Design a protein around this motif. Structure first.
Motif, mmCIF file in Angstrom:
data_model
loop_
_atom_site.group_PDB
_atom_site.id
_atom_site.type_symbol
_atom_site.label_atom_id
_atom_site.label_comp_id
_atom_site.label_asym_id
_atom_site.label_seq_id
_atom_site.Cartn_x
_atom_site.Cartn_y
_atom_site.Cartn_z
ATOM 1 N N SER A 39 45.412 39.039 40.325
ATOM 2 C CA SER A 39 46.481 39.935 39.709
ATOM 3 C C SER A 39 45.651 41.327 39.165
ATOM 4 C CB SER A 39 47.246 39.573 38.567
ATOM 5 O OG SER A 39 48.222 38.605 39.181
ATOM 6 N N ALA A 40 44.477 41.097 38.358
ATOM 7 C CA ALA A 40 43.732 41.850 37.647
ATOM 8 C C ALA A 40 43.169 42.901 38.772
ATOM 9 C CB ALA A 40 42.647 41.334 36.799
ATOM 10 N N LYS A 41 42.627 42.276 39.854
ATOM 11 C CA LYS A 41 42.005 43.191 40.760
ATOM 12 C C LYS A 41 42.828 43.866 41.645
ATOM 13 C CE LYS A 41 37.949 39.999 41.571
ATOM 14 N NZ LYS A 41 37.124 39.420 42.305
ATOM 15 N N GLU A 42 44.180 43.680 41.715
ATOM 16 C CA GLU A 42 45.255 44.221 42.397
ATOM 17 C C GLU A 42 45.629 45.443 41.655
ATOM 18 O OE1 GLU A 42 48.360 41.296 43.358
ATOM 19 O OE2 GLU A 42 46.965 40.287 44.894
ATOM 20 N N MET A 43 45.323 45.430 40.415
ATOM 21 C CA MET A 43 45.724 46.651 39.283
ATOM 22 C C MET A 43 44.683 47.551 39.393
ATOM 23 S SD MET A 43 48.724 46.285 38.229
ATOM 24 C CE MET A 43 48.667 47.284 37.004
ATOM 25 N N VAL A 44 43.345 47.341 39.828
ATOM 26 C CA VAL A 44 42.161 48.450 39.659
ATOM 27 C C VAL A 44 42.503 49.630 40.343
ATOM 28 C CG1 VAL A 44 40.041 48.752 40.246
ATOM 29 C CG2 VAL A 44 40.576 46.550 39.467
ATOM 30 N N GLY A 45 42.521 50.697 39.604
ATOM 31 C CA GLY A 45 42.826 51.961 40.134
ATOM 32 C C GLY A 45 44.399 52.526 39.861
ATOM 33 N N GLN A 46 45.141 51.500 39.278
ATOM 34 C CA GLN A 46 46.342 51.985 38.782
ATOM 35 C C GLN A 46 46.230 52.696 37.267
ATOM 36 O OE1 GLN A 46 49.500 51.497 40.509
ATOM 37 N NE2 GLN A 46 48.128 50.943 41.732
ATOM 38 N N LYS A 47 47.109 53.586 36.889
ATOM 39 C CA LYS A 47 46.950 54.090 35.720
ATOM 40 C C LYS A 47 48.190 53.849 34.719
ATOM 41 C CE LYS A 47 44.975 58.321 37.650
ATOM 42 N NZ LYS A 47 45.329 59.817 37.560
ATOM 43 N N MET A 48 47.883 53.797 33.439
ATOM 44 C CA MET A 48 48.848 53.571 32.397
ATOM 45 C C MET A 48 48.532 54.539 31.233
ATOM 46 S SD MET A 48 49.142 49.629 31.470
ATOM 47 C CE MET A 48 50.534 49.925 30.411
ATOM 48 N N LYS A 49 49.445 55.216 30.323
ATOM 49 C CA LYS A 49 49.147 56.060 29.103
ATOM 50 C C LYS A 49 48.127 55.096 28.266
ATOM 51 C CE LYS A 49 51.197 59.881 27.350
ATOM 52 N NZ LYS A 49 50.868 60.871 27.841
ATOM 53 N N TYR A 50 46.962 55.789 27.767
ATOM 54 C CA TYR A 50 46.041 55.061 26.744
ATOM 55 C C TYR A 50 46.643 55.615 25.421
ATOM 56 C CZ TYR A 50 42.043 52.592 24.817
ATOM 57 O OH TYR A 50 41.307 51.545 24.087
#
Length: 118
Positions: free
Chosen positions: A90-101
């Protein structure tokens, strides 16, 4: 305790805690702090992309720097953690996704707690 893959890492910064997921071999996956201040370049402070952050795989040593940090899986007293196989895929699938920091939103914490607990 030394971190094992799937562990949550709580990093003590000045005025807040940054969170990361330890994946082994000295790497974490985390919502990386942005490096561009609101209103840098042509952008308005009121841009929806102000404080945009990217999910990154980085070295634990680079993310912690000189800061104190600990493993903190204490949410395991409330929620059953997922298998480490699923946490890390799951963590590896999210790499390169964005969220508000947004520090007030605690998004860096919510990002990794959702990886561990679903």
């Amino acid at each position: 305790q030394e971190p094992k893959p799937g562990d949550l890492i709580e990093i003590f910064r000045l005025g807040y805690e940054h969170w990361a997921l330890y994946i082994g071999d000295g790497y974490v996956i985390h919502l990386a702090p942005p490096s561009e201040y609101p209103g840098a370049g042509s952008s308005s402070v009121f841009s929806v992309l102000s404080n945009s952050a990217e999910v990154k795989r980085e070295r634990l040593e680079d993310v912690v720097g000189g800061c104190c940090y600990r493993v903190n899986n204490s949410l395991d007293h409330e929620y059953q953690p997922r298998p480490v196989e699923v946490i890390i895929s799951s963590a590896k699938e999210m790499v390169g996704q964005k969220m508000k920091y947004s520090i007030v939103s605690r998004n860096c914490e919510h990002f990794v707690t959702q990886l561990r607990y679903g």
